[PDB]
Design a protein around this ligand. Sequence first.
Ligand SMILES: Nc1ccn([C@@H]2O[C@H](CO)[C@@H](OP(=O)(O)O)[C@H]2O)c(=O)n1
Ligand SMILES: Nc1ccn([C@@H]2O[C@H](CO)[C@@H](OP(=O)(O)O)[C@H]2O)c(=O)n1
Ligand SMILES: [Cl-]
Ligand SMILES: [Cl-]
Ligand SMILES: [Cl-]
Ligand SMILES: [Cl-]
Ligand SMILES: [Cl-]
Ligand code: NA
Ligand code: NA
Length: 124
Amino acid sequence: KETAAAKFERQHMDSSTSAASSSNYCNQMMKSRNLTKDRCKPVNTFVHESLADVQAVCSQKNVACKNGQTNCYQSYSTMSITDCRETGSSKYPNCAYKTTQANKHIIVACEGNPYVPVHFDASV
Ligand SMILES: Nc1ccn([C@@H]2O[C@H](CO)[C@@H](OP(=O)(O)O)[C@H]2O)c(=O)n1
Ligand SMILES: Nc1ccn([C@@H]2O[C@H](CO)[C@@H](OP(=O)(O)O)[C@H]2O)c(=O)n1
Ligand SMILES: [Cl-]
Ligand SMILES: [Cl-]
Ligand SMILES: [Cl-]
Ligand SMILES: [Cl-]
Ligand SMILES: [Cl-]
Ligand code: NA
Ligand code: NA
């Protein structure tokens, strides 16, 4: 029973490194954030910025979300991110991920009081 904000933190924050440094980053991180317990989660983005910087996006550029909701926000600046996406060789329980490191703007959906990120919509 995890709050939406806490789930976003676990799935999407990696403030301890500046960037992925190896092809095995996603395999490691998907496992240790408990994203491969029951199934291999197919796609998951990690953000290599402070939690404060990611939370601050909720006051930045208001944009539509993919699903048409209007509580999404696009970061004014690019951020260091890693996209983790399952390869064709991936088969639970032996999940396998491609690591793609990039510097891009993030789009998050925000909710609550405090008004914080609860969904990762996209990177641009
Ligand atoms: N893959 C994961 C890992 C944790 N969690 C949530 O985070 C909680 C653990 O802090 C989980 O509670 P359960 O252990 O009751 O499933 C679950 O609510 C999740 O929903 N999916
Ligand atoms: N670019 C993307 C697209 C999807 N996703 C993940 O895949 C899920 C469903 O598409 C998303 O749910 P949340 O936005 O609730 O975190 C997110 O965890 C991602 O992390 N990065
Ligand atoms: Cl930090
Ligand atoms: Cl912080
Ligand atoms: Cl804010
Ligand atoms: Cl505007
Ligand atoms: Cl922009
Ligand atoms: Na773990
Ligand atoms: Na931080």
